[PDB]
Design a protein around this ligand. Structure first.
Ligand SMILES: CCCCCCCC(=O)OC[C@H](COP(=O)([O-])O)OC(=O)CCCCCCC
Ligand SMILES: [Ca+2]
Lengths: 776, 322, 80, 85, 85
């Protein structure tokens, strides 16, 4: 058979296709804009700077020009129709310079073509007298040889070896559409935007063809998923890329003004179809699609375009080279941005589902009640009332492994409840027990008792807590017996006084698994008791997707390896420009920007790979025995989080960089310059503001010290001026010692009128920069 | 019809009951529904619908209550109370309003014919004014509102069918939906009509000065607003990726945008953002505040101040010198 | 000349910024607030949901003076 | 616009003068926005974001620009007519 | 004016010092406006709106105007009379 089965059976959206087509369209929208300026700007050494006088023959009166063609390594030039004074008089010499930037070499390759304005010139022009002036790409060797009518005398510095071999050097970098957008010679009708539009359309319909193959014509036996391997087998990816190229390639030659808008409509409908059929894609059929598209592009760049070639007065050349560098920088930045976007925003649906899942888990675990804790011995009714029904209840709770308990003993008891006021935060801090024990209490009578040591492992350390920071170990109580004896075990532990006295925290944590959304979650609760009696509470739910290395070549692995290669490329490019100017490359962005970008790029990939390894290790450890151990996935959930943040940070930088690239528009270049020149003034203003703020803050903190709660007008006029929200509402609870950085932001929001002082400075600077870019 | 709830867009099918007119019978029905388990792990959404009249002021009220059960567990409730007027012509003021509506339709016809009389041959470009664009958007919104009103009030057959027998369920959801749509369209139209008043306040040399300043400033204001929005969205995506799974204020991208706009007003709650990430939490907040109030708010001032001074200088050098 | 003034000012400031440390780091605020919660907001009795901060009648004062006041004064206390 | 959109749901926009006072209090950051966003999911936040942007980043700066230019011109021409004659 | 209008009702304007401090806190965004409107339905909102408008858009901008003009003049005289030899 049928072969066009109706797509779109569901409503979910795939972000990979949308992101990649958006990138591929934005890069074209910027490349066309720069290329228009490049084309409008240029719409106007092969030889030496010596004379080219030729007077060895007469009878050559005809107003015509001559052509000196010098080939080489990516260097070529045509003729030179200059404006001289001789004007090709009766038996006169035509000697003049030329604006030919062809950087040829001193090889035996130079062609001299003598035209004829009507009658042929009978004069014998030996050569141009020049030995070495600028580049010395040829030598002054006499030829004086006649050729056909307006033909060229082939020489050094009509067999089949010279009929079309000239095209092998002419159109080698001109007909090859990819490496020709910045290598087009003048006098050609390509406008330098046509060769960009056609190739953009070309890659667009490679993407569309691959998407439509993967989405609509899988009827082989369905050709994918069931019998397909995500890892490339040189058939699942390369073979389809080649056939997708061949089946739709001829329209490129067919399309190769008004015929050009239909190109935009064709690319629009192609991306629309790719997005429409792109919705119903499993995670593998998307990375496979990406690899097939990349393979098709690589095939069209190496083995097809090369096989279609068979059938004031000195500074105007700096701009073209600058723009040529700009194109390479633009392509590199687009590729890097696409890689980062795929690394960070490949699982947005999982992001929303994870938020919902963690919210649901907290609200069905009676988080309000757990944080409404009053002491350290009523948690047993808590467990018997809300925990065991939640775990062993015949309801929606796929646990994936039995729970666990890991308390502390501290090897020393604690005093009784404090009459009146209790400990401030974490008073009476001693040691931590690490020895063996026996049943009932810590007293080994015959040997290894039930209360084993349960030594810490090497995973998911700590949890910077209220009293101290444990890492992995404690009193490991399995609390198993899923069917009915879990309550019996809890009652036996309570009756035998397992952790009655000398118990800091509880540290209860098991697991979660949402079969529908496809994301797992690690729940970890703790009931750290600072004093005997009243206790605190702190729970954390981390949702994450368990993806492992042994799954093949999933998207995170591909993005990680691409990020690693980008990092190493940046590192070598920075080391070259570091060693080339030796030392003292300081007081600049320079190293302190490139090295930090390299650090972020490497760290992102390294943390993602570490997370992938840890997930696989923990999963293969869990399959060993299910009703035997716990395996504590809690470490993996941390790593993923870190990885995510790193990627986000990277993307942030890239976006900021995009802003500073808007200075390429002439009128928009001021904004970047102003902020660059006002930095010393702004830094001085901030220094003055922070000194004044420190003085006032010390005055305020040292001023009251009384707790009078009355209108002490003399003392009040200073303290209670912005204290209605500052004294105890801004951040006096615990942020003064937990997050000192947040306090300055909170007090800069309140007093945001002072920050208007910058308007005094920036304005002036801006005005100055509009007096030096308009009048002069 | 579809609903567009919070998590998804639910269809208009499912398993339904019409309850009774008496407390006892409805209580028995819901007890029977609860006994033979009706809501189980497969349940995804539940709706309750009814309406009231209140003859004192002639105004119906349509009530809908929705409860969503996401696959990840939990409950999400939402509600909707919508008043309607379906018996318009009862008093003289209603006839006055009808006459005013007819006058509005005549005014819209006059404006559109005046528009087409001019766009035909006179000034074929016509789009380099920004007042013509406002006029065309105004008439488009007005004709859309008129079409919605005609399509909505022309059929009230649900009310007529309900008046036959009154022991059935009156279905007024489409009427409420179209009332909300009409209200939105009319509010936007009124806003733009009131904005259009700037076209006539140039009665002295101060109004023209300010208008010229704004017109000459719009271009580079756009030029810098591009950068401002790029940086704004760069902060928003970072907040979404870092805090979007724990804070409920950054759970969705548009919610991140709204929270960032609320931070400028000073309506921030730090008590939840701070513990979502001990590092990168305070950093984001402080850098956002500094670079939003100390830097980007002041470049707008620099630009506006420069263009206003330049306009005044040109207007004072041209004058008193000729 | 300026360098001498600078160094003597830094010495006079480094001595002063640590002399004030011993005034604000004595945890007097903790004791004062502990006493404030001990004497102010504790209810007069378990059967009345009122405290000294929300007194409204003379009978409330008579209840307070035989109640939370005596408990706070009688249970490092009672100078004279 | 706010009166027509939220006039029957929020209670800070019940009457026109209430809308004016609420708009004056938005500038100082004294509203909920939890009830504005739920009363109308689209066109509710649009109003809020556009209002905040246009009030803070445009009109306040125009007020200060006018004041700065006038003060500079007054000081300049009083320094011109005086101390130069 | 606030003391004479809201003196016997609001408890934030019960004494003159409280009136001054309440106005200072209003500038910094500590508005209540509930009992302000309850106490006097007209001339209560009028006071609030006029105070907010004048203190937010006009009066606090003149300090910045003075500072801006002084900075411009200082920079001009320091960069023009110097930096020329
Ligand atoms: C001795 C140094 C003098 C510093 C001059 C400060 C000028 C100033 O604050 O400008 C007013 C400011 C922003 O402008 P506005 O629109 O609110 O009037 O709005 C505000 O002021 C509200 C913030 C509270 C100001 C606290 C004063 C530091
Ligand atoms: Ca018009």
């Amino acid at each position: 058979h049928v072969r066009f089965v109706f797509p779109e059976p569901t409503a979910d959206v795939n972000y990979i296709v949308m992101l990649t087509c958006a990138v591929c369209l934005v890069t074209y929208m910027v490349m066309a804009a720069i290329l228009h300026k490049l084309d409008q700007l240029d719409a106007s050494r092969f030889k030496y700077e010596i004379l080219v006088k030729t007077g060895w023959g007469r009878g050559s009166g005809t107003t015509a020009h001559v052509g000196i063609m010098l080939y080489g390594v990516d260097s070529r030039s045509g003729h030179r129709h200059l404006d001289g004074d001789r004007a090709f008089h009766r038996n006169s010499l035509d000697i003049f310079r030329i604006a030919t930037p062809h950087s040829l070499g001193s090889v035996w390759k130079i062609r001299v073509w003598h035209d004829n304005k009507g009658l042929s010139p009978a004069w014998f022009l030996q050569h141009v007298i020049v030995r070495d002036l600028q580049t010395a790409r040829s030598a002054f060797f006499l030829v004086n040889d006649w050729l056909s009518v307006e033909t060229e005398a082939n020489g050094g510095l009509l067999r089949f070896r010279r009929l079309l071999v000239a095209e092998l050097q002419r159109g080698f970098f001109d007909k090859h559409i990819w490496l020709s957008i910045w290598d087009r010679p003048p006098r050609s009708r390509f406008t330098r935007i046509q060769r960009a539009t056609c190739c953009v359309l070309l890659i667009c319909l490679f993407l569309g063809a691959n998407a439509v193959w993967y989405g609509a014509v899988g009827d082989s036996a369905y050709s994918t998923g069931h019998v397909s391997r995500l890892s490339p087998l040189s058939v699942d990816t390369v073979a389809v890329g080649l056939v997708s190229s061949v089946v739709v390639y001829p329209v490129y030659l067919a399309i190769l003004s008004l015929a050009h808008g239909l190109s935009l409509l064709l690319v629009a409908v192609a991306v629309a179809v790719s997005g429409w059929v792109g919705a119903s894609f499993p995670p593998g059929v998307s990375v496979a699609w990406l690899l097939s598209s990349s393979a098709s592009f690589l095939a069209s760049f190496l083995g097809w375009e090369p096989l279609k070639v068979l059938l004031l007065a000195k500074e105007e050349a700096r701009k073209v080279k600058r723009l040529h560098g700009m194109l390479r920088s633009l392509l590199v930045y687009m590729l890097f941005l696409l890689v980062t976007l795929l690394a960070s925003y490949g699982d947005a649906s999982c992001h929303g589902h994870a938020y919902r899942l963690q919210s649901a888990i907290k609200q069905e675990l009676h988080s309000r009640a757990f944080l409404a804790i009053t002491r350290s011995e009523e948690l047993w009714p808590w467990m018997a009332h809300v925990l065991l029904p939640y775990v062993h209840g015949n309801q929606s709770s796929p646990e994936l492994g039995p729970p666990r308990l890991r308390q502390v003993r501290l090897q020393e008891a604690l005093y009784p409840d404090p009459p009146g006021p209790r400990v401030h935060t974490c008073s009476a801090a001693g040691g931590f027990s690490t020895s063996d024990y026996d049943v009932g209490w810590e007293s080994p009578h015959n040997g290894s008792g039930t209360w084993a040591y349960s030594a810490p492992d090497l995973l998911g350390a700590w949890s910077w807590g209220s009293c101290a920071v444990y890492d992995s170990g404690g009193y490991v109580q399995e609390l198993g017996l899923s069917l009915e004896e879990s309550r019996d075990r809890l009652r036996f532990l309570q009756l035998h006084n397992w952790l009655d006295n000398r118990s800091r925290a509880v540290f209860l944590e098991l697991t979660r698994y949402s079969p529908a959304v496809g994301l797992h979650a690690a729940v970890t609760l703790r009931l750290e008791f600072p004093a005997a009696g009243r206790a605190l509470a702190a729970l954390s739910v981390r949702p994450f997707a368990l993806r492992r290395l042994s799954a093949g070549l999933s998207l995170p692995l591909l993005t990680s390896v691409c990020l690693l290669l980008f990092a190493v490329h940046f590192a070598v490019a920075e080391a070259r420009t570091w060693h080339r100017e030796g030392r003292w490359r300081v007081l600049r962005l320079g190293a302190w920007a490139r090295w930090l970008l390299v650090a972020l790029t490497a760290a992102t990939a390294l943390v993602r790979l570490a997370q992938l390894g840890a997930a696989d290790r923990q999963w293969t450890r869990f399959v060993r025995g299910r009703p035997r151990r716990f395996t504590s996935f809690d470490q993996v959930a941390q790593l993923s989080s870190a990885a995510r943040g790193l990627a986000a940070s990277l993307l942030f930088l890239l976006l900021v960089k995009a802003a500073q690239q808007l200075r390429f528009v002439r009128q928009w270049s001021v904004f970047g310059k102003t902020l660059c020149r006002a930095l010393p003034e702004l830094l001085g203003v901030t220094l003055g503001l922070v000194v004044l703020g420190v003085a006032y803050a010390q005055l305020a903190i040292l001023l009251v010290s009384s707790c009078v709660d009355s209108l002490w007008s003399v003392a009040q006029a200073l303290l209670v001026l912005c204290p209605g929200t500052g004294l105890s509402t801004l951040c006096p609870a615990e942020s003064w010692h937990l997050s000192p950085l947040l306090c300055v932001g909170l007090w800069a929001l309140r007093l945001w009128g002072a920050l208007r002082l910058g308007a005094v400075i920036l304005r002036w600077r801006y005005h100055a920069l509009r007096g030096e870019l308009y009048r002069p | 019809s579809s609903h567009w709830g919070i998590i998804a867009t639910y269809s208009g099918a499912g398993y339904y009951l019409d309850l009774s007119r008496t407390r006892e019978e409805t209580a028995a029905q819901v007890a029977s529904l609860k006994k033979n388990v009706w809501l189980d792990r497969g349940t995804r959404a539940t709706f309750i619908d009814f309406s009231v009249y209140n003859a004192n002021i002639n105004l119906f009220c349509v009530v809908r209550l929705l409860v969503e059960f996401p696959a990840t567990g939990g409950v999400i409730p939402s509600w909707q109370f919508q008043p309607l007027k379906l018996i318009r012509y009862v008093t003289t003021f209603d006839f006055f309003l009808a006459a005013c509506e007819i006058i509005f339709c005549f005014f819209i016809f006059y404006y559109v014919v005046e528009e087409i009389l001019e766009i035909r041959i006179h000034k074929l470009h016509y789009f380099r004014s920004f007042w013509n664009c406002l006029d065309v958007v105004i008439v488009v919104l007005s004709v859309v509102a008129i079409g919605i009103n005609i399509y909505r009030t022309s059929n009230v057959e649900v009310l007529l069918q309900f008046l036959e027998d009154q022991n059935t369920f009156p279905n007024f959801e489409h009427l409420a939906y179209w009332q909300i749509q009409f209200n939105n369209i009319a509010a936007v139209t009124v806003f733009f009509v009131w904005i259009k008043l700037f076209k006539f306040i140039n009665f002295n040399r101060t109004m023209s000065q300010l208008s010229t300043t704004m017109s000459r400033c719009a271009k580079d204001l756009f030029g810098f607003a591009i950068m401002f929005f790029i940086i704004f969205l760069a902060y928003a995506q970072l907040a979404y990726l870092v805090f979007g799974t724990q804070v409920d204020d950054f759970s969705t991208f548009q919610e991140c945008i709204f929270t960032q706009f609320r931070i400028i007003l000073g309506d921030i709650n730090f008590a939840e953002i701070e513990e979502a990430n001990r590092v990168l939490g305070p950093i984001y907040f402080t850098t956002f505040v500094f670079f939003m109030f100390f830097i980007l708010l002041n470049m707008f001032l620099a630009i506006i101040n420069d263009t206003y001074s330049e306009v005044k200088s040109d207007l004072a050098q041209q004058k008193a010198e000729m | 000349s300026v360098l001498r003034e600078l160094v003597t000012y830094l010495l006079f400031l480094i001595v002063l910024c640590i002399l004030t440390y011993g005034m604000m780091s004595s945890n007097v605020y903790y004791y004062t607030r502990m006493m404030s919660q001990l004497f102010l907001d504790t209810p007069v009795s378990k059967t009345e949901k009122t405290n000294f901060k929300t007194l409204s009648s003379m009978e409330d004062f008579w209840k307070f003076t035989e109640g939370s006041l005596l408990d706070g004064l009688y249970w490092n206390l009672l100078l004279g």
